[PDB]
């Protein structure tokens, strides 16, 4: 019944189907075979050295399998005809697919490429262009080949006795068509064949996702022990909601899903808002509307105050635009596919969306609301051709008295001026001429002629870039030349650091400007449920009416000059207190228009993908005889080149459209005057543009309809506004006039905010893709498991799947099934390093690198199939660990000796016990600067060489610096060659480090002297005693598996800040701020320098020791006081090694905080500050395992008896982890510390 | 040159921790190769007195 016994039979059966002649034993750590293909056999034929048997050996091992080398069997990969056992179905979706195909008739500039038919022996001017696009657009790179994904569902559908539709349309693709593509399993980036259609990998990636989405639901529906979902009155089947959706996209899935995701997201926002009894989850927090310290009460219901408000004309107009958006996506697919049926289950819900209720306390309404958010992720990573279009500023709106353009431009001048003043109070100033060159390392140049040169030329220019996104179409990224970005670095620096803090008060009548705007970081620091608690409590409040407008194509109306001049007017007038000092000869007012000049951002030439027209061939050669030029600009491989646009537009249209065309030089590609995403002021400026617009929003509402709609909060983030207001009348006519004056303010600014995008609702909040509904948490999961952003190279396979399980902690936290999230990792633990070995071996002997023989030079590489239960063997024993009973608990080596002593885990961890100390090891790979360096570095580099070299060869730790500059020089050649060149070196290392591997007995629970881990708690016993309250805590995030619902029930959501971040990580906060310190060195780096010397003779010998790290000099103050603090304050000198409590579900719980100790911990008082953390980090995993089993909630107490022999073993083992014997003569630390002097008298 | 016993300063000069002074700093320091040459200048002037 356990996941380790039932699930391991399935992943073994996948290997029993994939490599069909493999005898697999579970109790072996990893079995080894090999296989080869003749793509490399043909190559050394061409160099002269012919081979003995060309394909005779291939005949020997196809189906007889009778040959095996060195005793190691040789087994072939399965063909495509057999991955579904030759099954066939009716599959009405598949016959919709095959009539929705079209050859040689597509528009060559288009966003998401349609169904092109592959006909063999066709032309090399169209079909090579279509093969050029699909090689860039349709790529399924990642960590797992897509072939074994299709075999995995074939094995998984049999056990659940349920057939997914993604396999039904795939099983008809195997009997009529042989092989869709040839993905090489070594690199996963090459797809060199399409047999019937160019969009065949998109056909599978939307099918290998379609199958998991209904295995996720059907497993979850039995966990809630309900038959089907329940819209507010009627029964509804969730799989029919997806099968009605999968048929509609299947003509053109990247285009259909991008226009159908808008009514699906809008439906979940406005569901339970119009019903008269409304059930909320009563919350309580601070007086500010943005306070995050929230306390939850039980569920209750209340009468709706806004019942008659939804009879208005704002919602009735907004609903028919969304019912149109359903119908336009339908009519585009009713003709391109043969189907006459569409969406019959969803259309019955949108006709009455407001008045139907939604109750979160029943699970049959929370799964359905989560499912519709997770519908849209089948066609992940929309990769799209973009075209190069210009400014076209005749459409740019000129400032007028009748328009608000000049009033917007004078508002935003007073906001950059105000951000500079309020950064002066937080000690954020401009950079100085002294540290101008030192402060240039914040990015990864400066010449008086290179700074005066322009870029509005065909000869020299700027070059665009592009990077992908999860569901959206591919957004651009701007690459600016580094000569003219440093003038933007010097003047936008006290704005990047100022809005970097997380705290803020958002009141409109407050005078300050920093709290009301906020720019987050790359990763969400903390959880998502934890730091979005201000969104939850305002959907649970009867008197908050939130307004959140949306700007469609924000840059096209940021293109206007009104925010360009008004920003630069406020830059110049605020540099007036800095008007005397000169930057390298010239003033500061001259250099701001070197980063915001005319040939910098006003009018610059940009080169993207080119314009191109589809024409005939006979008229092409009659004109191309005069203009055959190249060399100025390049042309894609399908297209035929000409010189200019003016000879390319005269022959433009053709009924046959045989051959393509492209202008190389005479194009005049693109000129843009718009705030770039690449500048240092991207997220600072456009969020201030929402502030200048949003302040004009409150004025016209207050001047046309006064007394109504008072404003209480103002949150401005990237391309979003969020007003927390309250409405003072439930009127049908008056509210219709207030909602009209909001759109008239945006339209008279220049933008066009859609009435279907604008949100004016009482009981629903969306903010930065976090949906809050009626006091609870409705989650989406757009993160996916098949595709990826770029091709991923598995360099640290110990640390890759340890990082991949973090993105599987989040998935089950949004409602994915817990055990289905175990089966995915147990599949994904065997198929990672299978093709990372160079040459073949013979077992129980040496490992052959060179062969020089015709037999073994055919069997090139090996296969390494690890056991599926390598997920559960803990770290430090050459395999990564996650616990089977709960995914959020880190399996460590002290947890392995505990989890076998518990009676409720003798059945689950019975097959785990036989594979420990059985697994193979892990593929664990590991001039200008004379100006841009601190004077700690320049004095150390301009030294006499007789003094500079003694810090390099004999002595010195020196983890950052000139050799790290060489590592920074190794980081810039890293991307192609240095990753590949050392990959030839680690493989010769890994064969020796595998042949010298002996599976060693006598596991140890301990660490070195100068560090300690969570395994320190095994010195003492632990007695589960006491009794606590069995009160079920209340929490907003419903929709969890029972392995996660019971951890949040017994242990509530946290209410304070966690204390377990030790003072070793308090100085990491000092090293987190500096980006010249953040990406390079940290606490494990800086404590090794304290390991080289403690207890010096003067503090003036103390401040200077980290200038010898040659990074900074200011933060040696924080290392002056804290070492003086640890000379005053007690400390255990050791560090803390851990890998636990970092995933975003553990940060939400009330574990590892100061209020967690006071009820769940009882420890002896003779323990230091970093020893009580090692007990508490042990104590967190014990209680989370105590709750996820069903064991009774007790108070964990570590006990020290009076057994005078056992009191001696503790005083012997606490001593050696505090002070080292031999290393005292290395550090020359004094033993007269107060903490280490107590150890004589602690336990006695 | 013969140093004294290292316990003759440990029981009486650095005997009380949580206090430092002029003497308690000088005990934790070893002479360089040139300060040890100036000790040789002290002991030459004590043998040839005036």
């Amino acid at each position: 019944v356990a996941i380790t016994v039932q699930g391991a039979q399935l992943i073994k059966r996948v290997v029993e189907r994939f490599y069909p002649g493999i005898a697999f034993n579970i109790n072996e750590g990893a079995c080894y075979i090999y296989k080869f293909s003749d793509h490399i056999r043909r190559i050394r034929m061409k160099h002269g050295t012919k081979y003995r048997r060309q394909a005779e050996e291939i005949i020997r091992n196809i189906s007889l399998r009778k040959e095996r080398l060195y005793g190691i069997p040789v087994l072939d990969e399965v063909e495509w005809k057999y991955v579904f056992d030759g099954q066939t179905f009716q599959s009405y979706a598949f016959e919709v697919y095959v009539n929705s195909i079209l050859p040689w008739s597509e528009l060559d500039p288009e966003e998401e490429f349609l169904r092109n038919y592959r006909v063999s022996r066709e032309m090399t001017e169209v079909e090579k262009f279509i093969e050029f696009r699909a090689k860039n657009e349709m790529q399924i790179y990642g960590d797992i080949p897509i072939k074994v994904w299709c075999c995995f569902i074939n094995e998984l559908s049999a056990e659940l006795k349920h057939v997914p539709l993604g396999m039904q349309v795939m099983a008809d693709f195997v009997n009529r068509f042989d092989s869709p593509f040839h993905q090489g399993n070594r690199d996963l980036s090459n797809l060199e064949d399409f047999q019937v259609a160019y969009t065949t990998p998109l056909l599978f990636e939307m099918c290998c996702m379609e199958s998991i989405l209904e295995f996720n639901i059907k497993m979850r529906m039995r966990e809630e022990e309900i038959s089907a979902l329940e819209f507010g009155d009627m029964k509804v089947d969730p799989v029919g909601l997806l099968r009605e959706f999968f048929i509609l996209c299947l003509p053109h899935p990247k285009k259909i899903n991008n226009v159908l995701r808008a009514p699906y997201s809008w439906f979940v926002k406005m569901w339970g808002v119009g019903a008269d009894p409304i059930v909320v989850l009563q919350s309580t927090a601070g007086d500010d509307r943005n306070s995050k310290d929230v306390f939850y009460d039980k569920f209750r219901t209340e009468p709706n105050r806004y019942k008659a408000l939804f009879r208005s004309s704002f919602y009735n107009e907004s609903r028919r635009m969304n019912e149109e958006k359903i119908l336009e996506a339908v009519k585009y697919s009713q003709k391109l596919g043969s189907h006459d049926r569409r969406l019959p289950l969803f259309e019955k819900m949108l006709k009455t969306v407001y008045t139907t209720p939604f109750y979160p306390h029943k699970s049959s309404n929370m799964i359905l609301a989560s499912f519709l958010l997770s519908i849209q992720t089948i066609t992940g990573y929309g990769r799209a051709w973009v075209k190069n279009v210009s400014t076209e500023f005749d459409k740019q709106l000129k400032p007028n008295p009748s328009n608000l353009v000049q009033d917007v431009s004078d508002l935003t001048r007073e906001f950059f001026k105000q951000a500079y003043v309020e950064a002066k109070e937080r000690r954020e100033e401009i950079v100085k001429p002294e540290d101008l060159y030192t402060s240039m390392l914040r990015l990864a140049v400066f010449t008086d002629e290179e700074l005066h040169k322009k870029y509005n030329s065909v000869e020299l220019y700027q070059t665009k870039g592009s990077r992908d996104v999860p569901i959206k179409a591919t957004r651009t990224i701007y690459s600016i030349n580094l000569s003219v970005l440093v003038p933007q670095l010097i003047v936008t620096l006290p704005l990047n650091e100022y809005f970097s803090r997380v705290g803020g008060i958002t009141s409109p009548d407050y005078k300050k400007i920093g709290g009301k705007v906020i720019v987050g970081d790359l990763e969400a620091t903390g959880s998502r449920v934890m730091d979005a608690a201000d969104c939850f409590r305002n959907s649970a409040d009867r008197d908050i009416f939130t307004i959140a407008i949306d700007y469609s194509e924000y840059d096209t109306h940021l293109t206007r000059h009104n925010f360009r001049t008004g920003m630069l007017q406020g830059i110049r007038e605020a540099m007036a207190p800095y008007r005397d000092l000169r930057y390298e000869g010239y003033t500061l007012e001259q250099i701001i228009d070197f980063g915001y000049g005319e040939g910098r951002v006003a009018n610059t030439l940009w080169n993207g993908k080119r314009r191109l027209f589809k024409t005939t061939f006979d008229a092409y050669i009659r004109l191309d005889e005069s203009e055959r030029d190249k060399g100025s600009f390049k042309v894609p491989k399908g297209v035929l080149p000409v010189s200019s646009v003016d000879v390319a537009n005269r022959i433009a249209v053709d009924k046959g459209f045989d051959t393509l065309i492209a202008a190389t030089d005479g194009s005049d590609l693109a000129l843009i005057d718009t705030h770039l995403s690449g500048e240092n002021s991207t997220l600072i400026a456009n969020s201030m543009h929402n502030m200048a617009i949003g302040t004009l929003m409150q004025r016209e509402v207050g001047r046309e309809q006064p007394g109504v709609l008072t404003f209480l909060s103002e949150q401005y983030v990237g391309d979003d506004t969020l007003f927390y207001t309250k409405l003072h009348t439930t009127d049908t006519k008056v509210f219709d006039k207030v909602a009209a004056s909001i759109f008239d303010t945006v339209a008279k600014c220049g933008h066009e905010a859609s009435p279907s995008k604008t949100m004016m609702t009482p009981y629903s909040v969306e903010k930065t893709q976090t949906h809050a509904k009626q006091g609870c948490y409705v989650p989406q999961d757009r993160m996916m498991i098949i595709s990826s952003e770029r091709r991923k190279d598995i360099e640290d396979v110990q640390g890759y799947v340890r990082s991949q399980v973090q993105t599987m902690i989040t998935k089950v936290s949004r409602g994915f099934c817990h055990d289905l999230a175990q089966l995915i990792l147990m599949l994904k633990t065997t198929f990672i390093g299978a093709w990372k070995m160079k040459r073949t071996i013979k077992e129980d002997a040496m490992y052959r690198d060179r062969k020089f023989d015709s037999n073994d030079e055919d069997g090139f590489t090996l296969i390494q199939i690890r056991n599926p239960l390598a997920l559960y063997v803990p770290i430090g024993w050459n395999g990564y660990g996650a616990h089977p009973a709960a995914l959020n608990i880190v399996m460590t080596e002290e947890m392995y000796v505990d989890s076998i002593m518990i009676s409720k885990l003798d059945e689950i961890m019975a097959p785990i016990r036989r594979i420990v100390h059985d697994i193979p090891p892990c593929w664990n790979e590991t001039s200008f600067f004379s100006k841009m360096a601190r004077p700690a570095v320049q004095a150390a580099l301009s030294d006499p060489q007789i003094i500079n070299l003694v810090e390099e060869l004999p002595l010195g730790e020196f983890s950052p610096g000139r050799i790290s500059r060489t590592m920074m020089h190794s980081a810039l050649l890293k991307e192609s060659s240095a990753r590949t060149l050392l990959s030839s070196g680690y493989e010769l290392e890994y064969q020796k480090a595998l042949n010298s591997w002996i599976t060693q007995v006598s596991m140890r629970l301990g660490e070195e002297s100068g560090v300690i881990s969570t395994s320190y708690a095994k010195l003492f016993d632990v007695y589960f005693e006491g009794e606590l309250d069995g009160a079920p805590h209340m929490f907003p995030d419903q929709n969890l598996s029972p392995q996660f619902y019971i951890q949040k029930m017994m242990i509530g959501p946290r209410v304070s800040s966690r204390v377990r971040n030790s003072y070793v990580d308090r100085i990491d906060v000092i090293l987190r701020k500096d980006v010249v310190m953040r990406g390079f060195i940290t606490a494990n780096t800086i404590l090794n320098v304290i390991e080289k010397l403690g207890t010096n003779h003067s503090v003036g010998d103390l401040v200077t020791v980290f200038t010898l790290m040659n990074i900074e000099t200011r933060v040696a103050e924080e290392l002056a006081e804290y070492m003086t603090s640890e000379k005053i304050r007690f400390d255990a000198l050791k560090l803390l090694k851990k890998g636990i409590a970092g995933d975003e579900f553990t940060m939400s719980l009330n574990v590892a905080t100061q209020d967690f100790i006071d009820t769940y911990l009882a420890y002896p008082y003779q323990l230091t500050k970093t020893e009580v953390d090692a007990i508490s980090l042990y104590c967190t995993q014990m209680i989370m395992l105590r709750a996820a089993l069903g064991l009774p909630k007790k108070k964990m107490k570590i006990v020290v008896t009076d057994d005078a022999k056992k009191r001696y073993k503790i005083r012997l083992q606490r001593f050696r982890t505090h002070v080292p014997k031999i290393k005292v003569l290395k550090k020359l630390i004094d033993p007269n510390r107060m903490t280490v002097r107590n150890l004589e008298n602690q336990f006695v | 040159y013969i140093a004294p016993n290292p316990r003759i300063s440990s029981i009486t000069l650095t005997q009380r921790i949580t206090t430092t002074g002029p003497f308690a700093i000088l005990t934790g320091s070893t002479p360089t190769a040139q300060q040890l040459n100036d000790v040789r200048k002290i002991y030459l002037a004590l043998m040839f007195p005036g």
Binding site: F1215, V1219, K1221, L1225, P1231, V1236, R1237, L1239, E1240 | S10
Partner: peptide, 23 residues
């Protein structure tokens, strides 16, 4: 060199004599 080590529990009072193996 030539240092020896044994099973000791006195953290301060025995490592005083450990430098006597050094000197």
């Amino acid at each position: 060199e030539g240092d020896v080590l044994s099973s000791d529990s006195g953290p301060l009072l025995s490592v005083f004599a450990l430098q006597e193996i050094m000197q």
